[PDB]
Amino acid sequence: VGYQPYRVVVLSFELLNAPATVCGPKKSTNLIKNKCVNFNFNGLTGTGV
Amino acid sequence: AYSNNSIAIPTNFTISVTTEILPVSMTKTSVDCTMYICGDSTECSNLLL
Ligand SMILES: *[C@@H]1O[C@H](CO)[C@@H](O)[C@H](O)[C@H]1NC(C)=O
Ligand SMILES: *[C@@H]1O[C@H](CO)[C@@H](O)[C@H](O)[C@H]1NC(C)=O
């Protein structure tokens, strides 16, 4: 070990505000409004109405 | 024109009206301790405690 090959993959991320192309496996719930809730829009979280 | 035996006595007069402006009070303000710093976030409020 030390003279054996290693396969290296490095991923570079780019958040931006353009439409998302790669996403996590999270499941999407239905949308509600007129109510103080916790939301998650394309990875952007927060709390509000 | 100073002299040791000379005086000046006014004969007429003028009635003048002047203006003076003085600030008395300023606007009263209030600040929310938590909603300015950690607005709508339970984690940040817990840290602020
Ligand atoms: C001051 O008054 C005297 C008189 O008492 C006069 O002789 C003298 O000239 C006066 N002084 C001046 C500078 O005029
Ligand atoms: C004082 O001034 C007023 C305004 O100019 C004038 O009408 C009046 O005659 C004057 N008085 C005297 C005593 O000069």
PDB file of N, CA and C and ligand atoms in Angstrom:
ATOM      1  N   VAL A   1       0.848  -1.185   0.000  1.00  0.00           N
ATOM      2  CA  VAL A   1       0.000   0.000   0.000  1.00  0.00           C
ATOM      3  C   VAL A   1       0.885   1.237   0.000  1.00  0.00           C
ATOM      4  N   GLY A   2       0.598   2.164  -0.915  1.00  0.00           N
ATOM      5  CA  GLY A   2       1.461   3.286  -1.210  1.00  0.00           C
ATOM      6  C   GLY A   2       2.037   3.239  -2.610  1.00  0.00           C
ATOM      7  N   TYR A   3       2.235   2.039  -3.151  1.00  0.00           N
ATOM      8  CA  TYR A   3       2.599   1.846  -4.546  1.00  0.00           C
ATOM      9  C   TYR A   3       1.452   1.281  -5.371  1.00  0.00           C
ATOM     10  N   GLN A   4       0.259   1.168  -4.792  1.00  0.00           N
ATOM     11  CA  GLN A   4      -0.933   0.648  -5.447  1.00  0.00           C
ATOM     12  C   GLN A   4      -1.774   1.793  -6.006  1.00  0.00           C
ATOM     13  N   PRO A   5      -2.417   1.587  -7.152  1.00  0.00           N
ATOM     14  CA  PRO A   5      -3.166   2.678  -7.784  1.00  0.00           C
ATOM     15  C   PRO A   5      -4.391   3.083  -6.979  1.00  0.00           C
ATOM     16  N   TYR A   6      -4.720   4.371  -7.063  1.00  0.00           N
ATOM     17  CA  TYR A   6      -5.917   4.932  -6.450  1.00  0.00           C
ATOM     18  C   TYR A   6      -6.658   5.763  -7.484  1.00  0.00           C
ATOM     19  N   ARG A   7      -7.956   5.510  -7.631  1.00  0.00           N
ATOM     20  CA  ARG A   7      -8.791   6.259  -8.560  1.00  0.00           C
ATOM     21  C   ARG A   7      -9.403   7.439  -7.819  1.00  0.00           C
ATOM     22  N   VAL A   8      -9.155   8.644  -8.321  1.00  0.00           N
ATOM     23  CA  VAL A   8      -9.521   9.877  -7.637  1.00  0.00           C
ATOM     24  C   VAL A   8     -10.544  10.610  -8.489  1.00  0.00           C
ATOM     25  N   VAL A   9     -11.694  10.916  -7.897  1.00  0.00           N
ATOM     26  CA  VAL A   9     -12.737  11.709  -8.536  1.00  0.00           C
ATOM     27  C   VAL A   9     -12.974  12.935  -7.670  1.00  0.00           C
ATOM     28  N   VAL A  10     -12.909  14.114  -8.279  1.00  0.00           N
ATOM     29  CA  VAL A  10     -13.148  15.376  -7.590  1.00  0.00           C
ATOM     30  C   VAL A  10     -14.279  16.107  -8.300  1.00  0.00           C
ATOM     31  N   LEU A  11     -15.292  16.500  -7.536  1.00  0.00           N
ATOM     32  CA  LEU A  11     -16.483  17.149  -8.064  1.00  0.00           C
ATOM     33  C   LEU A  11     -16.483  18.614  -7.658  1.00  0.00           C
ATOM     34  N   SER A  12     -16.711  19.496  -8.625  1.00  0.00           N
ATOM     35  CA  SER A  12     -16.790  20.929  -8.382  1.00  0.00           C
ATOM     36  C   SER A  12     -18.238  21.375  -8.521  1.00  0.00           C
ATOM     37  N   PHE A  13     -18.741  22.068  -7.505  1.00  0.00           N
ATOM     38  CA  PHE A  13     -20.135  22.475  -7.436  1.00  0.00           C
ATOM     39  C   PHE A  13     -20.281  23.952  -7.775  1.00  0.00           C
ATOM     40  N   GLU A  14     -21.482  24.319  -8.223  1.00  0.00           N
ATOM     41  CA  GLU A  14     -21.784  25.696  -8.610  1.00  0.00           C
ATOM     42  C   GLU A  14     -23.254  25.941  -8.288  1.00  0.00           C
ATOM     43  N   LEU A  15     -23.514  26.676  -7.208  1.00  0.00           N
ATOM     44  CA  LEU A  15     -24.889  26.931  -6.797  1.00  0.00           C
ATOM     45  C   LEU A  15     -25.613  27.858  -7.767  1.00  0.00           C
ATOM     46  N   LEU A  16     -25.148  29.106  -7.880  1.00  0.00           N
ATOM     47  CA  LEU A  16     -25.749  30.101  -8.766  1.00  0.00           C
ATOM     48  C   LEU A  16     -27.240  30.278  -8.490  1.00  0.00           C
ATOM     49  N   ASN A  17     -27.955  30.928  -9.410  1.00  0.00           N
ATOM     50  CA  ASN A  17     -29.411  30.994  -9.351  1.00  0.00           C
ATOM     51  C   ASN A  17     -30.065  30.505 -10.638  1.00  0.00           C
ATOM     52  N   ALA A  18     -29.287  29.956 -11.567  1.00  0.00           N
ATOM     53  CA  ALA A  18     -29.839  29.347 -12.762  1.00  0.00           C
ATOM     54  C   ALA A  18     -30.619  28.087 -12.386  1.00  0.00           C
ATOM     55  N   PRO A  19     -31.456  27.572 -13.291  1.00  0.00           N
ATOM     56  CA  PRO A  19     -32.203  26.350 -12.973  1.00  0.00           C
ATOM     57  C   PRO A  19     -31.272  25.200 -12.619  1.00  0.00           C
ATOM     58  N   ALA A  20     -31.667  24.434 -11.606  1.00  0.00           N
ATOM     59  CA  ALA A  20     -30.845  23.342 -11.111  1.00  0.00           C
ATOM     60  C   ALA A  20     -30.850  22.176 -12.089  1.00  0.00           C
ATOM     61  N   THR A  21     -29.693  21.531 -12.229  1.00  0.00           N
ATOM     62  CA  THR A  21     -29.550  20.369 -13.094  1.00  0.00           C
ATOM     63  C   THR A  21     -29.271  19.079 -12.341  1.00  0.00           C
ATOM     64  N   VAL A  22     -28.584  19.144 -11.204  1.00  0.00           N
ATOM     65  CA  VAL A  22     -28.300  17.977 -10.377  1.00  0.00           C
ATOM     66  C   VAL A  22     -28.885  18.227  -8.995  1.00  0.00           C
ATOM     67  N   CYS A  23     -29.667  17.271  -8.499  1.00  0.00           N
ATOM     68  CA  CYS A  23     -30.385  17.430  -7.244  1.00  0.00           C
ATOM     69  C   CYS A  23     -30.239  16.179  -6.389  1.00  0.00           C
ATOM     70  N   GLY A  24     -30.543  16.335  -5.104  1.00  0.00           N
ATOM     71  CA  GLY A  24     -30.532  15.229  -4.176  1.00  0.00           C
ATOM     72  C   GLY A  24     -31.782  14.387  -4.286  1.00  0.00           C
ATOM     73  N   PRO A  25     -31.764  13.239  -3.608  1.00  0.00           N
ATOM     74  CA  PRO A  25     -32.879  12.291  -3.728  1.00  0.00           C
ATOM     75  C   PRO A  25     -34.060  12.609  -2.821  1.00  0.00           C
ATOM     76  N   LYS A  26     -34.111  13.824  -2.282  1.00  0.00           N
ATOM     77  CA  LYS A  26     -35.206  14.203  -1.401  1.00  0.00           C
ATOM     78  C   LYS A  26     -36.540  14.183  -2.139  1.00  0.00           C
ATOM     79  N   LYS A  27     -37.584  13.787  -1.419  1.00  0.00           N
ATOM     80  CA  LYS A  27     -38.927  13.721  -1.969  1.00  0.00           C
ATOM     81  C   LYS A  27     -39.643  15.052  -1.775  1.00  0.00           C
ATOM     82  N   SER A  28     -40.487  15.396  -2.742  1.00  0.00           N
ATOM     83  CA  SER A  28     -41.178  16.677  -2.763  1.00  0.00           C
ATOM     84  C   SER A  28     -42.579  16.521  -2.189  1.00  0.00           C
ATOM     85  N   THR A  29     -42.919  17.376  -1.231  1.00  0.00           N
ATOM     86  CA  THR A  29     -44.256  17.416  -0.666  1.00  0.00           C
ATOM     87  C   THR A  29     -45.114  18.428  -1.420  1.00  0.00           C
ATOM     88  N   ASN A  30     -46.407  18.429  -1.110  1.00  0.00           N
ATOM     89  CA  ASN A  30     -47.305  19.404  -1.707  1.00  0.00           C
ATOM     90  C   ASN A  30     -47.083  20.781  -1.089  1.00  0.00           C
ATOM     91  N   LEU A  31     -47.486  21.812  -1.824  1.00  0.00           N
ATOM     92  CA  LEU A  31     -47.230  23.191  -1.433  1.00  0.00           C
ATOM     93  C   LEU A  31     -48.430  23.768  -0.695  1.00  0.00           C
ATOM     94  N   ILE A  32     -48.162  24.453   0.418  1.00  0.00           N
ATOM     95  CA  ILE A  32     -49.179  25.180   1.163  1.00  0.00           C
ATOM     96  C   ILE A  32     -48.702  26.615   1.340  1.00  0.00           C
ATOM     97  N   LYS A  33     -49.662  27.519   1.520  1.00  0.00           N
ATOM     98  CA  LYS A  33     -49.374  28.940   1.635  1.00  0.00           C
ATOM     99  C   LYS A  33     -50.293  29.549   2.686  1.00  0.00           C
ATOM    100  N   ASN A  34     -50.142  30.860   2.894  1.00  0.00           N
ATOM    101  CA  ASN A  34     -50.900  31.597   3.907  1.00  0.00           C
ATOM    102  C   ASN A  34     -50.689  30.995   5.295  1.00  0.00           C
ATOM    103  N   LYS A  35     -49.455  30.582   5.574  1.00  0.00           N
ATOM    104  CA  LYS A  35     -49.136  29.883   6.809  1.00  0.00           C
ATOM    105  C   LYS A  35     -47.630  29.932   7.018  1.00  0.00           C
ATOM    106  N   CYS A  36     -47.208  30.217   8.249  1.00  0.00           N
ATOM    107  CA  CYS A  36     -45.782  30.257   8.563  1.00  0.00           C
ATOM    108  C   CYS A  36     -45.247  28.832   8.606  1.00  0.00           C
ATOM    109  N   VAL A  37     -44.354  28.501   7.673  1.00  0.00           N
ATOM    110  CA  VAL A  37     -43.851  27.145   7.500  1.00  0.00           C
ATOM    111  C   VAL A  37     -42.347  27.195   7.264  1.00  0.00           C
ATOM    112  N   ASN A  38     -41.742  26.011   7.221  1.00  0.00           N
ATOM    113  CA  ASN A  38     -40.357  25.840   6.802  1.00  0.00           C
ATOM    114  C   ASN A  38     -40.362  25.307   5.375  1.00  0.00           C
ATOM    115  N   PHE A  39     -39.664  25.992   4.477  1.00  0.00           N
ATOM    116  CA  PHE A  39     -39.663  25.623   3.071  1.00  0.00           C
ATOM    117  C   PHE A  39     -38.253  25.292   2.599  1.00  0.00           C
ATOM    118  N   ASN A  40     -38.187  24.600   1.461  1.00  0.00           N
ATOM    119  CA  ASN A  40     -36.916  24.195   0.863  1.00  0.00           C
ATOM    120  C   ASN A  40     -37.105  24.223  -0.651  1.00  0.00           C
ATOM    121  N   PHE A  41     -36.650  25.301  -1.284  1.00  0.00           N
ATOM    122  CA  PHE A  41     -36.797  25.501  -2.722  1.00  0.00           C
ATOM    123  C   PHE A  41     -35.433  25.332  -3.379  1.00  0.00           C
ATOM    124  N   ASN A  42     -35.232  24.191  -4.040  1.00  0.00           N
ATOM    125  CA  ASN A  42     -33.988  23.892  -4.755  1.00  0.00           C
ATOM    126  C   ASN A  42     -32.773  23.995  -3.836  1.00  0.00           C
ATOM    127  N   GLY A  43     -32.940  23.572  -2.586  1.00  0.00           N
ATOM    128  CA  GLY A  43     -31.877  23.641  -1.609  1.00  0.00           C
ATOM    129  C   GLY A  43     -31.825  24.917  -0.798  1.00  0.00           C
ATOM    130  N   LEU A  44     -32.653  25.907  -1.119  1.00  0.00           N
ATOM    131  CA  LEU A  44     -32.700  27.166  -0.389  1.00  0.00           C
ATOM    132  C   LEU A  44     -33.787  27.064   0.673  1.00  0.00           C
ATOM    133  N   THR A  45     -33.388  27.147   1.937  1.00  0.00           N
ATOM    134  CA  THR A  45     -34.299  26.976   3.057  1.00  0.00           C
ATOM    135  C   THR A  45     -34.683  28.327   3.651  1.00  0.00           C
ATOM    136  N   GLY A  46     -35.537  28.275   4.664  1.00  0.00           N
ATOM    137  CA  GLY A  46     -35.980  29.481   5.329  1.00  0.00           C
ATOM    138  C   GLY A  46     -37.245  29.224   6.117  1.00  0.00           C
ATOM    139  N   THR A  47     -37.770  30.308   6.683  1.00  0.00           N
ATOM    140  CA  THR A  47     -39.011  30.271   7.445  1.00  0.00           C
ATOM    141  C   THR A  47     -39.792  31.545   7.170  1.00  0.00           C
ATOM    142  N   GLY A  48     -41.085  31.403   6.912  1.00  0.00           N
ATOM    143  CA  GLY A  48     -41.911  32.557   6.628  1.00  0.00           C
ATOM    144  C   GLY A  48     -43.262  32.131   6.092  1.00  0.00           C
ATOM    145  N   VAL A  49     -43.978  33.112   5.550  1.00  0.00           N
ATOM    146  CA  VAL A  49     -45.305  32.912   4.980  1.00  0.00           C
ATOM    147  C   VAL A  49     -45.212  33.082   3.472  1.00  0.00           C
TER     148      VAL A  49
ATOM    149  N   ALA B   1     -15.864 108.010  16.865  1.00  0.00           N
ATOM    150  CA  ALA B   1     -15.362 109.365  17.091  1.00  0.00           C
ATOM    151  C   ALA B   1     -15.443 109.675  18.582  1.00  0.00           C
ATOM    152  N   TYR B   2     -14.478 109.140  19.324  1.00  0.00           N
ATOM    153  CA  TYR B   2     -14.464 109.313  20.769  1.00  0.00           C
ATOM    154  C   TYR B   2     -13.928 110.688  21.150  1.00  0.00           C
ATOM    155  N   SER B   3     -14.554 111.290  22.157  1.00  0.00           N
ATOM    156  CA  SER B   3     -14.100 112.549  22.727  1.00  0.00           C
ATOM    157  C   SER B   3     -14.547 112.594  24.179  1.00  0.00           C
ATOM    158  N   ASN B   4     -13.881 113.433  24.969  1.00  0.00           N
ATOM    159  CA  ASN B   4     -14.168 113.492  26.395  1.00  0.00           C
ATOM    160  C   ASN B   4     -15.262 114.493  26.746  1.00  0.00           C
ATOM    161  N   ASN B   5     -15.878 115.134  25.748  1.00  0.00           N
ATOM    162  CA  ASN B   5     -17.016 116.010  26.001  1.00  0.00           C
ATOM    163  C   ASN B   5     -18.107 115.858  24.944  1.00  0.00           C
ATOM    164  N   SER B   6     -18.119 114.756  24.200  1.00  0.00           N
ATOM    165  CA  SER B   6     -19.064 114.551  23.112  1.00  0.00           C
ATOM    166  C   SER B   6     -19.902 113.309  23.373  1.00  0.00           C
ATOM    167  N   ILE B   7     -21.207 113.421  23.118  1.00  0.00           N
ATOM    168  CA  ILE B   7     -22.144 112.318  23.282  1.00  0.00           C
ATOM    169  C   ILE B   7     -23.051 112.258  22.060  1.00  0.00           C
ATOM    170  N   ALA B   8     -23.650 111.089  21.849  1.00  0.00           N
ATOM    171  CA  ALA B   8     -24.600 110.867  20.767  1.00  0.00           C
ATOM    172  C   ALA B   8     -25.898 110.330  21.349  1.00  0.00           C
ATOM    173  N   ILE B   9     -27.015 110.941  20.970  1.00  0.00           N
ATOM    174  CA  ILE B   9     -28.330 110.565  21.470  1.00  0.00           C
ATOM    175  C   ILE B   9     -29.199 110.178  20.279  1.00  0.00           C
ATOM    176  N   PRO B  10     -29.761 108.971  20.248  1.00  0.00           N
ATOM    177  CA  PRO B  10     -30.631 108.592  19.131  1.00  0.00           C
ATOM    178  C   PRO B  10     -31.927 109.387  19.131  1.00  0.00           C
ATOM    179  N   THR B  11     -32.435 109.643  17.928  1.00  0.00           N
ATOM    180  CA  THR B  11     -33.628 110.458  17.727  1.00  0.00           C
ATOM    181  C   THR B  11     -34.856 109.650  17.337  1.00  0.00           C
ATOM    182  N   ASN B  12     -34.695 108.623  16.512  1.00  0.00           N
ATOM    183  CA  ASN B  12     -35.783 107.761  16.077  1.00  0.00           C
ATOM    184  C   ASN B  12     -35.525 106.337  16.557  1.00  0.00           C
ATOM    185  N   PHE B  13     -36.398 105.420  16.144  1.00  0.00           N
ATOM    186  CA  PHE B  13     -36.222 104.017  16.482  1.00  0.00           C
ATOM    187  C   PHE B  13     -36.894 103.151  15.428  1.00  0.00           C
ATOM    188  N   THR B  14     -36.498 101.880  15.402  1.00  0.00           N
ATOM    189  CA  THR B  14     -37.081 100.885  14.515  1.00  0.00           C
ATOM    190  C   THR B  14     -37.536  99.689  15.337  1.00  0.00           C
ATOM    191  N   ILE B  15     -38.699  99.147  14.993  1.00  0.00           N
ATOM    192  CA  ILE B  15     -39.233  97.954  15.639  1.00  0.00           C
ATOM    193  C   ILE B  15     -38.962  96.769  14.724  1.00  0.00           C
ATOM    194  N   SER B  16     -38.109  95.854  15.174  1.00  0.00           N
ATOM    195  CA  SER B  16     -37.681  94.716  14.374  1.00  0.00           C
ATOM    196  C   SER B  16     -38.190  93.422  14.991  1.00  0.00           C
ATOM    197  N   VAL B  17     -38.579  92.484  14.133  1.00  0.00           N
ATOM    198  CA  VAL B  17     -39.033  91.163  14.550  1.00  0.00           C
ATOM    199  C   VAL B  17     -38.064  90.139  13.976  1.00  0.00           C
ATOM    200  N   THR B  18     -37.475  89.329  14.848  1.00  0.00           N
ATOM    201  CA  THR B  18     -36.499  88.321  14.463  1.00  0.00           C
ATOM    202  C   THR B  18     -37.044  86.925  14.739  1.00  0.00           C
ATOM    203  N   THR B  19     -36.384  85.932  14.150  1.00  0.00           N
ATOM    204  CA  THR B  19     -36.807  84.542  14.232  1.00  0.00           C
ATOM    205  C   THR B  19     -35.714  83.697  14.872  1.00  0.00           C
ATOM    206  N   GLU B  20     -36.122  82.776  15.742  1.00  0.00           N
ATOM    207  CA  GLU B  20     -35.208  81.822  16.354  1.00  0.00           C
ATOM    208  C   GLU B  20     -35.845  80.443  16.316  1.00  0.00           C
ATOM    209  N   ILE B  21     -35.075  79.447  15.887  1.00  0.00           N
ATOM    210  CA  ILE B  21     -35.554  78.080  15.727  1.00  0.00           C
ATOM    211  C   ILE B  21     -34.715  77.174  16.615  1.00  0.00           C
ATOM    212  N   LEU B  22     -35.383  76.357  17.428  1.00  0.00           N
ATOM    213  CA  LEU B  22     -34.711  75.464  18.365  1.00  0.00           C
ATOM    214  C   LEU B  22     -35.315  74.071  18.249  1.00  0.00           C
ATOM    215  N   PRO B  23     -34.524  73.045  17.940  1.00  0.00           N
ATOM    216  CA  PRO B  23     -35.044  71.674  18.005  1.00  0.00           C
ATOM    217  C   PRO B  23     -35.450  71.315  19.427  1.00  0.00           C
ATOM    218  N   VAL B  24     -36.545  70.563  19.545  1.00  0.00           N
ATOM    219  CA  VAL B  24     -37.106  70.189  20.835  1.00  0.00           C
ATOM    220  C   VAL B  24     -37.076  68.683  21.054  1.00  0.00           C
ATOM    221  N   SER B  25     -37.425  67.903  20.035  1.00  0.00           N
ATOM    222  CA  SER B  25     -37.464  66.457  20.174  1.00  0.00           C
ATOM    223  C   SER B  25     -37.062  65.816  18.855  1.00  0.00           C
ATOM    224  N   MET B  26     -36.715  64.537  18.930  1.00  0.00           N
ATOM    225  CA  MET B  26     -36.385  63.735  17.765  1.00  0.00           C
ATOM    226  C   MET B  26     -37.269  62.496  17.739  1.00  0.00           C
ATOM    227  N   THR B  27     -37.169  61.741  16.650  1.00  0.00           N
ATOM    228  CA  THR B  27     -38.011  60.566  16.481  1.00  0.00           C
ATOM    229  C   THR B  27     -37.659  59.494  17.505  1.00  0.00           C
ATOM    230  N   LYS B  28     -38.681  58.786  17.974  1.00  0.00           N
ATOM    231  CA  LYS B  28     -38.521  57.696  18.925  1.00  0.00           C
ATOM    232  C   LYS B  28     -38.562  56.375  18.170  1.00  0.00           C
ATOM    233  N   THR B  29     -37.639  55.474  18.498  1.00  0.00           N
ATOM    234  CA  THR B  29     -37.465  54.241  17.747  1.00  0.00           C
ATOM    235  C   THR B  29     -37.381  53.049  18.689  1.00  0.00           C
ATOM    236  N   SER B  30     -37.717  51.877  18.155  1.00  0.00           N
ATOM    237  CA  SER B  30     -37.602  50.616  18.869  1.00  0.00           C
ATOM    238  C   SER B  30     -36.965  49.582  17.952  1.00  0.00           C
ATOM    239  N   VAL B  31     -36.236  48.644  18.551  1.00  0.00           N
ATOM    240  CA  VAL B  31     -35.505  47.623  17.811  1.00  0.00           C
ATOM    241  C   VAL B  31     -35.853  46.259  18.387  1.00  0.00           C
ATOM    242  N   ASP B  32     -36.170  45.309  17.510  1.00  0.00           N
ATOM    243  CA  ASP B  32     -36.383  43.932  17.928  1.00  0.00           C
ATOM    244  C   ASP B  32     -35.040  43.234  18.100  1.00  0.00           C
ATOM    245  N   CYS B  33     -34.804  42.707  19.302  1.00  0.00           N
ATOM    246  CA  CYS B  33     -33.522  42.083  19.613  1.00  0.00           C
ATOM    247  C   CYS B  33     -33.247  40.889  18.707  1.00  0.00           C
ATOM    248  N   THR B  34     -34.240  40.020  18.528  1.00  0.00           N
ATOM    249  CA  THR B  34     -34.014  38.756  17.839  1.00  0.00           C
ATOM    250  C   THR B  34     -34.272  38.838  16.340  1.00  0.00           C
ATOM    251  N   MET B  35     -35.285  39.593  15.914  1.00  0.00           N
ATOM    252  CA  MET B  35     -35.649  39.582  14.502  1.00  0.00           C
ATOM    253  C   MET B  35     -34.686  40.394  13.644  1.00  0.00           C
ATOM    254  N   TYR B  36     -33.855  41.243  14.252  1.00  0.00           N
ATOM    255  CA  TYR B  36     -32.824  41.934  13.483  1.00  0.00           C
ATOM    256  C   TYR B  36     -31.609  41.043  13.254  1.00  0.00           C
ATOM    257  N   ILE B  37     -31.238  40.239  14.249  1.00  0.00           N
ATOM    258  CA  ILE B  37     -30.012  39.452  14.181  1.00  0.00           C
ATOM    259  C   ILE B  37     -30.290  38.090  13.560  1.00  0.00           C
ATOM    260  N   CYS B  38     -31.178  37.319  14.185  1.00  0.00           N
ATOM    261  CA  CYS B  38     -31.423  35.940  13.782  1.00  0.00           C
ATOM    262  C   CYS B  38     -32.848  35.758  13.279  1.00  0.00           C
ATOM    263  N   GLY B  39     -33.298  36.654  12.403  1.00  0.00           N
ATOM    264  CA  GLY B  39     -34.676  36.684  11.947  1.00  0.00           C
ATOM    265  C   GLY B  39     -35.258  35.362  11.488  1.00  0.00           C
ATOM    266  N   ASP B  40     -36.246  34.864  12.236  1.00  0.00           N
ATOM    267  CA  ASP B  40     -37.003  33.665  11.876  1.00  0.00           C
ATOM    268  C   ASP B  40     -36.087  32.455  11.691  1.00  0.00           C
ATOM    269  N   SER B  41     -35.387  32.088  12.762  1.00  0.00           N
ATOM    270  CA  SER B  41     -34.516  30.916  12.738  1.00  0.00           C
ATOM    271  C   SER B  41     -34.347  30.430  14.170  1.00  0.00           C
ATOM    272  N   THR B  42     -34.869  29.236  14.459  1.00  0.00           N
ATOM    273  CA  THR B  42     -34.785  28.697  15.812  1.00  0.00           C
ATOM    274  C   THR B  42     -33.341  28.407  16.207  1.00  0.00           C
ATOM    275  N   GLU B  43     -32.535  27.902  15.270  1.00  0.00           N
ATOM    276  CA  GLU B  43     -31.136  27.613  15.573  1.00  0.00           C
ATOM    277  C   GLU B  43     -30.379  28.880  15.950  1.00  0.00           C
ATOM    278  N   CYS B  44     -30.557  29.947  15.171  1.00  0.00           N
ATOM    279  CA  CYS B  44     -29.847  31.187  15.453  1.00  0.00           C
ATOM    280  C   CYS B  44     -30.345  31.827  16.741  1.00  0.00           C
ATOM    281  N   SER B  45     -31.644  31.717  17.026  1.00  0.00           N
ATOM    282  CA  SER B  45     -32.164  32.226  18.292  1.00  0.00           C
ATOM    283  C   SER B  45     -31.584  31.456  19.474  1.00  0.00           C
ATOM    284  N   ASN B  46     -31.478  30.132  19.343  1.00  0.00           N
ATOM    285  CA  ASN B  46     -30.866  29.326  20.394  1.00  0.00           C
ATOM    286  C   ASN B  46     -29.416  29.731  20.617  1.00  0.00           C
ATOM    287  N   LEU B  47     -28.674  29.965  19.532  1.00  0.00           N
ATOM    288  CA  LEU B  47     -27.297  30.432  19.675  1.00  0.00           C
ATOM    289  C   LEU B  47     -27.230  31.821  20.302  1.00  0.00           C
ATOM    290  N   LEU B  48     -28.163  32.708  19.950  1.00  0.00           N
ATOM    291  CA  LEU B  48     -28.199  34.050  20.520  1.00  0.00           C
ATOM    292  C   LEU B  48     -28.539  34.042  22.004  1.00  0.00           C
ATOM    293  N   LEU B  49     -29.275  33.033  22.476  1.00  0.00           N
ATOM    294  CA  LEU B  49     -29.558  32.931  23.906  1.00  0.00           C
ATOM    295  C   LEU B  49     -28.301  32.786  24.756  1.00  0.00           C
TER     296      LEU B  49
HETATM  297  C1  LIG C   1     -10.443 116.708  27.521  1.00  0.00           C
HETATM  298  O1  LIG C   1     -11.134 117.776  28.179  1.00  0.00           O
HETATM  299  C2  LIG C   1     -10.317 118.940  28.374  1.00  0.00           C
HETATM  300  C3  LIG C   1     -11.137 119.919  29.182  1.00  0.00           C
HETATM  301  O2  LIG C   1     -11.385 119.429  30.493  1.00  0.00           O
HETATM  302  C4  LIG C   1      -9.879 119.496  27.022  1.00  0.00           C
HETATM  303  O3  LIG C   1      -9.014 120.606  27.232  1.00  0.00           O
HETATM  304  C5  LIG C   1      -9.161 118.422  26.214  1.00  0.00           C
HETATM  305  O4  LIG C   1      -8.881 118.903  24.905  1.00  0.00           O
HETATM  306  C6  LIG C   1     -10.014 117.158  26.122  1.00  0.00           C
HETATM  307  N1  LIG C   1      -9.290 116.102  25.433  1.00  0.00           N
HETATM  308  C7  LIG C   1      -9.304 115.953  24.104  1.00  0.00           C
HETATM  309  C8  LIG C   1      -8.500 114.811  23.563  1.00  0.00           C
HETATM  310  O5  LIG C   1      -9.937 116.708  23.372  1.00  0.00           O
HETATM  311  C1  LIG C   2     -38.869 108.057  12.188  1.00  0.00           C
HETATM  312  O1  LIG C   2     -38.893 107.239  11.010  1.00  0.00           O
HETATM  313  C2  LIG C   2     -40.170 107.187  10.359  1.00  0.00           C
HETATM  314  C3  LIG C   2     -40.037 106.208   9.216  1.00  0.00           C
HETATM  315  O2  LIG C   2     -39.134 106.685   8.227  1.00  0.00           O
HETATM  316  C4  LIG C   2     -40.569 108.587   9.906  1.00  0.00           C
HETATM  317  O3  LIG C   2     -41.859 108.539   9.305  1.00  0.00           O
HETATM  318  C5  LIG C   2     -40.582 109.533  11.099  1.00  0.00           C
HETATM  319  O4  LIG C   2     -40.850 110.861  10.664  1.00  0.00           O
HETATM  320  C6  LIG C   2     -39.240 109.496  11.825  1.00  0.00           C
HETATM  321  N1  LIG C   2     -39.279 110.337  13.010  1.00  0.00           N
HETATM  322  C7  LIG C   2     -38.433 111.352  13.216  1.00  0.00           C
HETATM  323  C8  LIG C   2     -38.619 112.113  14.494  1.00  0.00           C
HETATM  324  O5  LIG C   2     -37.557 111.641  12.408  1.00  0.00           O
END
